[PDB]
């Protein structure tokens, strides 16, 4: 078998973290249009038979806590795991509403030795966020 | 008897390392728009990496920023697929 076993009773969780409004003291602008993203994802992964949970405007502490809790759920009947992050970012960093979170800290909860119910199962992180401030000028074809 | 603790992760990034990522205030982000569209179209026909490859092509060819600010006008984006997966991933049962 060259393909992951996807016929567990459940496809798995799809966590969508949708950060639109940030605390004023961060200086971060509101991410207009991200609700269109969150709704589109919700419906798309519903049709793929994922159990979608949309969360909105989470602090960096709420994000970390959410990932810890989700990593501690019973995933034994689930084929895979999906987490979508919609926020401001920089390289290796996603922003809570009140400050930054290391992407590594988020994904470490799901490491093969720390989330045993997901050992051997695909863990997908979909990240809509800046990775810096470079602009791609493109080249004509 | 063991697998790496880093195995079986995939990180679908909206943009290349070091780069801005583009979001349209009305249509949503270029990447999520394209990702949902390609999943809709191909989740029943294609392996996941080949779907994400279509997302790469859609973002790269069909999107270009329009801005009154010359610094930010006419810019492009390529998403970034980072795969530590050990097997093929199909969404159809």
């Amino acid at each position: 078998d060259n393909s992951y076993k996807m016929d567990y009773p459940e496809m798995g969780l799809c966590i969508i973290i949708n950060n639109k409004n940030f605390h004023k003291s961060t200086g971060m602008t509101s991410r207009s249009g991200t609700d269109v993203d969150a709704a589109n994802l919700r419906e798309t992964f519903r049709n793929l038979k994922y159990e979608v949970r949309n969360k909105n405007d989470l602090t960096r502490e709420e994000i970390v806590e959410l990932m810890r809790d989700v990593s501690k759920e019973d995933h034994s009947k689930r084929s895979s795991f999906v987490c979508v992050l919609l926020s401001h970012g920089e390289e290796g960093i996603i922003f809570g509403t009140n400050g930054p979170v290391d992407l590594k800290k988020i994904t470490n909860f799901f490491r093969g030795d720390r989330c045993r119910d997901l050992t051997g199962k695909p863990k997908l992180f979909i990240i809509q966020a800046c990775r810096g401030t470079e602009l791609d000028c493109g080249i004509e074809t | 008897h063991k697998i790496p603790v880093e195995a079986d992760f995939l990180y679908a990034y909206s943009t290349a390392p070091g780069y801005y990522s583009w979001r349209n205030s009305k249509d949503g982000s270029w990447f999520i728009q394209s990702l949902c569209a390609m999943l809709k179209q191909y989740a029943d026909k294609l392996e996941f990496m080949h779907i994400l490859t279509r997302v790469n092509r859609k973002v790269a060819t069909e999107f270009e920023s329009f801005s009154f600010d010359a610094t930010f006008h006419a810019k492009k984006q390529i998403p970034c697929i980072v795969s530590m997966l050990t097997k093929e991933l199909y969404f159809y049962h």
Partner: peptide, 4 residues
């Protein structure tokens, strides 16, 4: 179009 805006930047994130």
């Amino acid at each position: 179009d805006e930047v994130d």
